[PDB]
Write a protein that binds this ligand. Structure first.
Ligand SMILES: NC(=O)c1ccc[n+]([C@@H]2O[C@H](COP(=O)([O-])OP(=O)(O)OC[C@H]3O[C@@H](n4cnc5c(N)ncnc54)[C@H](O)[C@@H]3O)[C@@H](O)[C@H]2O)c1
Ligand SMILES: NC(=O)c1ccc[n+]([C@@H]2O[C@H](COP(=O)([O-])OP(=O)(O)OC[C@H]3O[C@@H](n4cnc5c(N)ncnc54)[C@H](O)[C@@H]3O)[C@@H](O)[C@H]2O)c1
Ligand SMILES: NC(=O)c1ccc[n+]([C@@H]2O[C@H](COP(=O)([O-])OP(=O)(O)OC[C@H]3O[C@@H](n4cnc5c(N)ncnc54)[C@H](O)[C@@H]3O)[C@@H](O)[C@H]2O)c1
Ligand SMILES: NC(=O)c1ccc[n+]([C@@H]2O[C@H](COP(=O)([O-])OP(=O)(O)OC[C@H]3O[C@@H](n4cnc5c(N)ncnc54)[C@H](O)[C@@H]3O)[C@@H](O)[C@H]2O)c1
Ligand SMILES: CNC(=O)c1cnc(NC2CCN(c3ccccn3)CC2)c(NCc2ccc(F)c(Oc3ccccc3)c2)c1
Ligand SMILES: CNC(=O)c1cnc(NC2CCN(c3ccccn3)CC2)c(NCc2ccc(F)c(Oc3ccccc3)c2)c1
Lengths: 267, 249, 268, 264
């Protein structure tokens, strides 16, 4: 008697057990969903992480920059879930921006090749995934992507913030296409979560950037009327599952904020 | 086994069986919630409507313009749900603007007495209800109000649109207060519901379409916010409008 | 040649020489505008303040809560500027919220009578002024009101923030009406300025706690603003209002221009 | 006694006399500004402007053009002189990403070229020119409101969403020099590509789509909207280049007849 009982859902973006996608996958399985997972590059290592999930799930290779991976995705998912079965949900939890465009490097010093790679992986791929998977989605279906509120500029995030602005626009266009299939498309704008890259910047991977991210995180918990725990991805995973469910059936091309309400408060 | 199993929820705003609050109340009961209902003025007529709901629920009088009704509300709800029990949810589905400020009357011809009454009932009362009920709410609780996107001006809705702009601001302040109790506060901005060119353009803009004769998708959205499935969302607006507000043409 | 050469502009909201309206009036006169000023209640005291402006201007009584003052306004302005002459600009620089709705008093403790008075003066009156003055405005005309960004909640401002949310909505409806006359309607959302009430809260009038939270708000504003923010200087705000009163933003209406050092565009 | 008397302003984006940049350049010269123009033929068009102005080559995708830009501008305005204004009126999206081609059928090479020219180049131009800008300076870019999706504009709308974000970051950098950075979000203007789509170049369906958008725009705008007249847009850019909006940065000013503030 789970929120997602009998739903077939594809979850991309698991790299470590701290990944937001790991928590999305875990909560979805606790709620009765049958998953199909996608991983990038380090598949053997990712399989060791996904073995820690409460239930078994097939793991498929997917590099969103690889046109052949995208062209074969629907076929490979259909083989994993059985012929005549379609997906009810798709989770895009993919993002990347090279250090030249996200970190200590000045905003003006990011070369376009790095910015373009970042936008391809972080924004364009939301449309690529929808193009590949909409033909194998059921009506009442739901596509969810991960966002970080880019309405205002902030230190260090730089070109990743620009990529999120592009993602929000892409989501609105994806909703127009998804609507033809009776499928919704939405983003979850999360507050800061201590994943691999976030733990590295706070850890000093130098001093100036580390301090900026610390100040940003402290301010977030301060502004949030219900507080914000950057070490806990569960409220974010629950929000994604709410959008994957049948309980937000008239919401599409939109953004749901799972940020403790921090974006609604100035001070 | 439902979405709101064992939750105690107060639902205001039922006047007819077409009221958005009637559909919110119906879906919440289908999902296992134990309700307390509030009504305005025509209580005998409202009790006949609430008798049509799938389960029994106590009906309490509440005129949001009446300070005595507000002062006694928590006490009356506690008596209805039993001593030692608190609310998990509150639904504000109240709105009114006299014809002088909402309809065919020119925007400039609405007298302030009418605008003030409309704002009192439609916006200020969201704070009044939260003030009265937060002392009797459990942590993890949820306050939901009804909204109509007022970010852009439109024909006829005139001063009611102004009242919705005020409501959205009130909601952000209510969230600051509610947070102290571990309670969330959010609005559901719905598309038009039958409770003409403006309403036709909605279904055309909406990527998943819009059915103005069906309040169920709106009621389901309210129930999602009343549940434990949006635990990090507060002082916010969820749009149950078929996605029309995200599309220009 | 001034930015507003030969323009006839009504400016409301002067109470002290620190009032944003005083600085709007001063810059407009420096730029060649012919003004008509409106004041509330203490008119003799306001006349002593307006005598400090670079040029003479008739001062008319206007209580926005007084229906008779609104009904006679157009007639009184016409008498001041001469028959056959119309206004090119209108500046609404009026705001009020009692201490029960704006200050140290809890958000839930503001009674509706106080909130209603505050909304009447701060939001509804923008429509009242437009209704009274649009029949005596020239095409190409401009109505400007003062705003404080209410998109997010903040400490102390409380019901004044709610009144500003209502004002922004009113402005969008006023633009629909003004458009029929070839007149624009816009708001200038300013950063914090040390006017009468602002000087009082910073000074400790509302206590230690309120003084500290307004100080923190002001420091954060100058920090966030990429070009900084000087709360002691109303001139950048006055210049922005004059830009909207000019012919240089001719396709902007029902809108908000931010004169806040760019603070609202930055998170940290 | 013009709005921009004695100001030295760089204007990019002139291709035809219908280009928004042509009208920005014309109004700025009428208002006393001394211009430096950049083009990507164009000299024959710029000869139609009221005053003479040096024309410099600038392909924003060309790293050598960007690296030498400040030096070439300094040579044109004289040593010891700096710019007071910069106008970015550059945009491009191949037909695969903007037009009749389905949103999902745009290849990344085309989208990436479009984003490079339309969004990233706003940061490139600021990087190259901020070292040669005076305090009180102003950088202005052209935008088309991308807050909501719309037919045909597709990936160009995505590029504009990216541009709005870029502008907010450019403002942080510009602030260090006492320089403002803002965008003007204009309503539809009948420039080269816009005249082609309305004319039927992309077919019957696309032509009808853009005609409906234009009609709706004029209808919603409380003061109306004339798509054949770029002058209100050029005036707005000049207002931002002036000293009259000195506390506005990382922002968007809408020169759209107020259409974006009205639903119907
Ligand atoms: N961590 C936060 O603070 C935070 C906040 C808000 C939103 N988000 C977003 O949440 C999403 C997940 O990030 P995370 O924080 O869980 O971090 P993460 O590092 O654990 O996850 C990012 C994932 O993207 C994958 N990826 C990168 N390049 C790829 C490619 N070419 N093909 C396919 N997948 C590729 C990586 O393998 C990884 O699994 C991202 O979109 C991120 O922007 C994160
Ligand atoms: N109908 C739509 O198209 C639409 C769209 C979006 C949002 N909404 C909002 O949803 C809410 C419910 O409206 P509805 O469409 O269900 O219509 P409705 O007429 O059925 O409900 C409005 C309710 O407000 C109550 N009310 C009025 N004055 C009151 C007072 N003094 N004290 C207490 N309650 C009072 C009425 O008794 C009634 O039950 C309102 O806030 C409305 O603005 C409606
Ligand atoms: N000071 C700031 O930090 C700040 C920031 C942003 C916007 N604003 C806005 O700027 C405007 C001017 O405020 P200010 O800061 O110059 O303060 P102020 O105290 O100098 O001016 C407010 C004016 O409102 C007038 N007023 C009040 N009740 C009135 C009534 N019934 N009829 C007519 N006039 C009436 C007062 O007489 C006074 O002249 C207001 O709308 C305010 O909300 C101020
Ligand atoms: N309806 C509209 O026309 C409209 C609406 C809003 C905003 N805008 C924006 O206004 C700006 C000007 O466009 P326009 O409508 O005048 O069209 P246009 O065709 O007249 O101008 C576009 C310019 O971009 C230049 N450009 C393209 N690739 C370049 C490169 N690699 N390096 C340098 N320059 C390059 C072209 O040479 C041309 O000068 C654009 O940013 C556009 O997106 C246009
Ligand atoms: C003798 N007269 C007064 O004591 C008086 C005048 N105008 C007032 N409210 C106006 C001021 C101008 N304005 C502003 C001012 C600042 C931001 C936005 N709007 C509109 C509201 C006013 N309000 C009550 C009050 C009484 C005493 C105060 F110290 C404040 O300051 C304050 C509170 C909260 C946030 C910022 C500042 C406010 C009192
Ligand atoms: C010989 N050169 C070309 O054929 C050419 C020039 N610039 C172009 N794109 C520019 C146009 C101006 N601009 C705009 C225009 C309108 C809104 C936003 N940006 C930036 C992008 C361009 N794009 C492909 C295209 C090719 C043919 C067209 F009719 C269009 O028009 C169109 C498409 C979709 C929406 C509105 C209009 C576009 C082609």
């Amino acid at each position: 008697t789970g929120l997602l009982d009998g739903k077939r859902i594809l979850v991309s973006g698991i790299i470590t057990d701290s990944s937001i996608a790991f928590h999305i996958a875990r909560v979805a399985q606790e709620q009765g969903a049958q998953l199909v997972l996608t991983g990038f590059d380090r598949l053997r290592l990712i399989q060791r992480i996904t073995d820690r999930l409460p239930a078994k799930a097939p793991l498929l290779e997917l590099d969103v920059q690889n046109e052949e991976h995208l062209a074969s995705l629907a076929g490979r998912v259909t083989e994993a879930i059985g012929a005549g079965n379609k997906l009810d949900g798709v989770v895009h939890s993919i993002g990347f921006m090279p250090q030249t465009g996200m970190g200590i490097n000045p905003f003006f010093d990011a070369p376009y090749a790095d910015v373009s790679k970042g936008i391809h992986i972080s924004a364009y791929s939301y449309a690529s995934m929808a193009k590949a998977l909409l033909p194998i989605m059921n009506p009442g279906g739901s596509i969810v992507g991960m966002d970080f509120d880019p309405s205002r500029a902030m230190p260090a995030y730089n070109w990743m913030t620009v990529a999120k602005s592009a993602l929000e626009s892409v989501n609105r266009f994806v909703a127009r296409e998804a609507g033809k299939y009776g499928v919704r498309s939405n983003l979850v704008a999360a507050g800061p979560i201590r994943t691999l890259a976030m733990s590295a910047i706070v850890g000093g991977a130098g001093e100036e950037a580390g301090a900026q991210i610390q100040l940003l995180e402290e301010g977030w918990d301060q502004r949030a009327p219900i507080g914000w725990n950057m070490k806990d991805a569960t409220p974010v995973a629950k929000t994604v599952c709410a959008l994957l469910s049948d309980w937000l059936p008239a919401t599409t091309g939109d953004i749901i904020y799972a940020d403790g309400g921090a974006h609604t408060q100035l001070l």
